[PDB]
Symmetry: C3
Subunit: 297 residues, 3 copies
């Protein structure tokens, strides 16, 4: 097996990876997906820490380790500080995947931990998703040079992670969100700065027709309610809006979905959709990531 050397212990936002690093990861995920499960992490253990329990993440991670000959250790966020607990894990274990709300907390755990820490999802960031998404796209295009991804919806953590992800690999990305719901300046900013070096064109705006125009890929996600709903109704993915993209676009969604909200069934269940392939690749992307991180011994 030709395992990738990452020059980082942790993976938190996506930004601690070089561009080459990200491809190597992707290319490796794909090789693993094709190849019969190697016990590359014999007896290694991944701690799994949760704020609110999240199935999709937990299972995809635990699965991966198990398939790599490892073990996943389910811990809870019913806790001594998140410093003390980092110290401890390190003695007895090989890595940690945390999902919690405050990203600052994760950063802290990483500094203090002496084993790899992986952000399962914080409020601000969701690297692993984006990484599975890039994998999915690359499976289709075999390249990011010259590719447009439109994301329309709420300016959320998966949005952030896509921005950084696209910037890193020189994939162009435009975002359309309603007036209130733009993503964070600080991130947009970082993303733009990465892009200066990869020639990726990143943009944020409001009219979605503009985002989707000539896009190779469209991505949405789920959204007191009375007034909000009426504001996002125009940001729905449908026969009508998707006509402005390329004939040959594919649809992405991180799931789960509420049909006839963010996306019409016609689209999500149509042949343009590849949400399922996407879903699967969570497993594999992560596996690739895990193995690289764990061989920095």
């Amino acid at each position: 097996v030709q395992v990738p050397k990452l020059n980082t212990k942790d993976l938190l936002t996506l930004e601690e990876l070089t561009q080459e690093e990200i491809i190597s990861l992707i290319e490796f995920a794909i090789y693993l997906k094709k190849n019969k499960q190697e016990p590359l992490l014999q007896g290694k253990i991944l701690g799994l820490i949760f704020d609110k329990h999240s199935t999709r993440t937990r299972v995809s991670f635990e699965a991966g380790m198990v398939q790599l000959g490892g073990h996943g250790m389910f811990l809870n966020g019913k806790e001594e500080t998140v410093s003390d607990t980092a110290k401890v894990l390190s003695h007895y274990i090989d890595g940690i995947m945390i999902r919690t709300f405050s990203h600052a907390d994760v950063e802290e755990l990483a500094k203090e931990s002496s084993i790899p820490v992986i952000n399962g999802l914080t409020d601000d960031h969701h690297p692993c998703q984006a990484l599975a998404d890039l994998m999915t796209i690359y499976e289709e295009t075999n390249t990011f040079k010259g590719i447009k991804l439109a994301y329309v919806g709420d300016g959320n953590n998966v949005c952030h992670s896509l921005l950084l992800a696209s910037a890193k690999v020189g994939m162009h990305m435009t975002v359309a969100t309603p007036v209130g719901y733009r993503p964070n300046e600080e991130i947009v900013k970082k993303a733009l700065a990465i892009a200066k070096e990869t020639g990726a064109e990143i943009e944020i705006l409001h009219n979605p027709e503009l985002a989707v125009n000539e896009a190779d890929f469209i991505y949405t996600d789920v959204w007191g309610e009375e007034e909000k709903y009426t504001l996002f109704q125009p940001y729905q993915i449908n026969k009508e809006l998707v006509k402005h993209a390329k004939q040959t676009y594919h649809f992405l969604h991180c799931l789960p979905a509420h049909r006839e909200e963010e996306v019409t069934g016609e689209i999500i269940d149509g042949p343009q959709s590849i949400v399922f392939e996407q879903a699967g690749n969570r497993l594999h992307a992560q596996k690739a990531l895990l193995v690289s991180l764990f061989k920095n011994v």
Copy 2:
């Protein structure tokens, strides 16, 4: 290893199995029990879903997988619908054992899931138990042709599952329950219909002496309270009642028991009892079931 081909993805009530299928399973469970643990499910994963946490079931399942080289994944019923969650599991995993209260829910999960689903126990059904019970009986008799099982007690889910189980294998079964506590028409009905084809004699009635008469096996289980208790007092298993069965009967109980309620200690701890052997076979029956289901790939 000579693994049984089941013509079904799921196992919910017992009724999706042919009679041959059930023996093959039993015969296989026994072979496995005798034979040093094969890693027949290397790296496969069984999701374990719980409504209220139940030890006996959870452990017997997890154990089995572990002994088969697999892994059990404990999930909770602190959950998005039970549709969404089925879809997800299927991507990352190989099978699901669910215990929940509403059987309808399980049915749903099975339809929607694209991997095997096993009913750990619903309010109406408890297949796995019955299957371990048949195994136990067969260990003793080596045949169901001509065998009578009496169940006295409450007309509960394990009762149901025994009815169907006995009907399928042509084992005769009579049930005695107090006036209020007969089992469900719909099941009795199905059971009777199966029996028409296997020549099993099934009956439901009230006087327990009648149920136990010439029985090869007696089976009870645990039972506002002030008036109920006085009604079941006569449905106790004891020196007195067991005299009407065959000299050579054996006693079963799925456990746990309240001695000097449903059963006197004399009986349950007497040499006629085989509740322990029963208990053990949970493990093995299940193992057999799991392996067959998982090789329908």
Copy 3:
């Protein structure tokens, strides 16, 4: 591998071990620590039972099993009595580690269980800790003959376990605790009785300078509050107090710590400290223990 034969099924207080038994264990832990992880418990399963969830214990145990080719099964203390549950575990499993509050409960589980039971920690006892501590000391001294350990602080369960532990191996130990907070007569008593046969000198008193005098090792641990705090302030480990020990003493603490309470940072983070080495050895001591217990088949 040269595995130790223990003449006991369970390990609850430390007192069911002979002195030889304890060394053999220690010596084995060390060998295991040095040697690449043997799959000595292939497919064996350790049940893990919790009263309040405790990370350090849970992880160190689960880890160990995993590294020994086993599996740890996390159960909860959301439970039928702790008799019924012992019976059950035994059918499907190989051993149990319990942490609960009432030691009496553990005793009970052990009697009733027909597989090994290990006290993770009760209010009165914490064997596994002490055992990791002895390992740590022995790593340094290679012998207990002639060695003094001072424990100052609250007369707590780890204190108890140290008393018994030291008594068993003929290590001298003095304890200094404030007036209210002496450890239990009944234990001191047992400990003294063991010591009569190993020549260990055990003592309990109040002035800590006396405890630490000419000590080879110093051990503290964490401690309505307004009046208590002022009482223990003098029982702090610091530059000042540690001068009365040997030049060449080492500091122990079971962690976690509150610096500038029981111990000044100067000490705990100083080169005299070996709290980390201590921490690690939890894993290994336990592994050694587990393997010996599990080969009493």
